[PDB]
Design a protein around this ligand. Structure first.
Ligand SMILES: Cc1ncc(COP(=O)(O)O)c(CNCCCC(=O)O)c1O
Length: 404
């Protein structure tokens, strides 16, 4: 007989690393906004694989692209050309209006690529002496699990026990233009990297004008503005890029997640020639980066986001969702924040009542969500959700919260 949910749990515990403690639910199927476990139970997905399935689970067009390409050609490596990569590159660089794209697989690789680009540009264009180039980050940032990524982190669970740490990474508070100015007084600073909204920190939305400030502060000090839109980009927040809300053009744009609809690890780094061309042949790459299969999947995913106008959907439905969430009692839900379909609530955590328990009961009532720490619950359903479905999921969130 097929394994039960408990069987799945014990098997992963026995033969898999304990680097996660996931919400006890064992899914075997997913489609659109919905997930199904081995017992056949139906659930709303309100995490969307950290925006990777903005298009919903197993969106037919992207599945068709994957299936059509998998029979033809999947991996030539970059020692030779394949026929798809140039097509994808032209499409995506004209969609976001940058000169060039460097393809990688995972989001952390896009971040690493951005850091290498920043340092090369600093040494070779800005004249920073080797090796004194600094990159500034914002506290609460998350951009991966490599040693470099955790070296920028202020979250002890990311970095504790994994040092020594990468030099040249300065940290300043988020949503703090004066701190950024002070930091950008150092001429050896090559770049400032920042999330338009801090996802894993708990959907931290900075104040209006922060992004435009950052653009101005980077421009005035000859510092590269790196926007990590891996979670916030691709329709999730109600625009194609979150930075669009303030009409800001970063120097480097990081893409991932929804770039494939969950079908293939594809990330992208976008920038103009004066930054991209600092890296010469043989100095950077990846085995699977830019393989034809991922490129087909990515073209399809981006087409889906454009054709179904998922950005406008996310904007309208996020308005509705936050409105309904504000009606929860302030004595139990202390805050609701977000943009588009990236939202979170903060609950008045107690010794006995926390966000984990809330997510357990939400699961019990057919809605899957992720708690950050003990007091933050993310609400981020796929952008294909309908209003009638969004309501009903809201009705589950209510009832669950007011059950405690
Ligand atoms: C803004 C932002 N940029 C970059 C990244 C890095 O993306 P990778 O594909 O996990 O390396 C993230 C990582 N997201 C992680 C959640 C999934 C998990 O840890 O299991 C992010 O949030």
């Amino acid at each position: 007989g097929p394994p039960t949910s408990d069987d799945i749990f014990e098997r992963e515990y026995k033969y898999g690393a304990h680097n996660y403690h996931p919400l006890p639910v064992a899914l075997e199927r997913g489609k659109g906004i919905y997930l199904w476990d081995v017992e056949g139970r139906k659930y709303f997905d309100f995490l969307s694989s950290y925006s990777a399935v903005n298009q919903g689970h197993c969106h037919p067009k992207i599945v068709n692209a994957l299936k059509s390409q998998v029979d033809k050609l999947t991996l030539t490596s970059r020692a030779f050309y394949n026929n798809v990569l140039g097509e994808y590159e032209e499409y995506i660089t004209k969609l976001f209006n940058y000169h060039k794209v460097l393809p990688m697989n995972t989001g952390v690789e896009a971040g690493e690529t951005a850091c290498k680009l920043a340092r090369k540009w600093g040494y070779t264009v800005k004249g920073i002496q080797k090796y004194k180039a600094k990159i500034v980050f914002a506290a609460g940032n998350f951009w991966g699990r490599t040693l470099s990524a955790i070296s920028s982190s202020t979250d002890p669970t990311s970095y504790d026990g994994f040092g020594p740490f990468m030099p040249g990474f300065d940290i300043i508070p988020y949503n703090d233009l004066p701190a950024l100015e002070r930091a950008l007084q150092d001429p050896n600073v090559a770049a400032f990297m920042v999330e338009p909204i801090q996802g894993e920190a708990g959907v931290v939305v900075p104040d209006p004008g922060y992004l435009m400030g950052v653009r101005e502060l980077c421009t005035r000090h000859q510092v590269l503005f790196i926007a990590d839109e891996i979670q916030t980009g691709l329709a999730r927040t109600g625009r194609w890029l979150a930075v669009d809300y303030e009409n800001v053009r970063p120097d480097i744009v990081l893409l991932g997640k929804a770039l494939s609809g969950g079908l293939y690890p594809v990330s992208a780094v976008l920038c103009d020639d004066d930054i991209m061309l600092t890296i010469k042949p043989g100095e950077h790459g990846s085995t699977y980066g830019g393989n034809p299969l991922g490129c087909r999947v990515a073209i399809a995913a981006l087409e889906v986001l454009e054709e179904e106008n998922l950005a406008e959907n996310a904007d309208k439905l996020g308005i509705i969702l936050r409105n309904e969430l504000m009606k929860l009692p302030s004595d139990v839900v202390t805050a609701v924040r977000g943009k588009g379909l990236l939202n979170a609530i903060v609950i008045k955590e107690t010794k006995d009542w926390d966000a984990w328990k809330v997510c357990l009961r939400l699961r019990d009532n057919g809605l899957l969500a992720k708690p950050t720490h003990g007091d933050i619950i993310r609400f981020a359903p796929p952008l294909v959700i309908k209003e009638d479905e969004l309501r009903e999921s809201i009705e589950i969130i209510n009832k669950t919260i007011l059950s405690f």
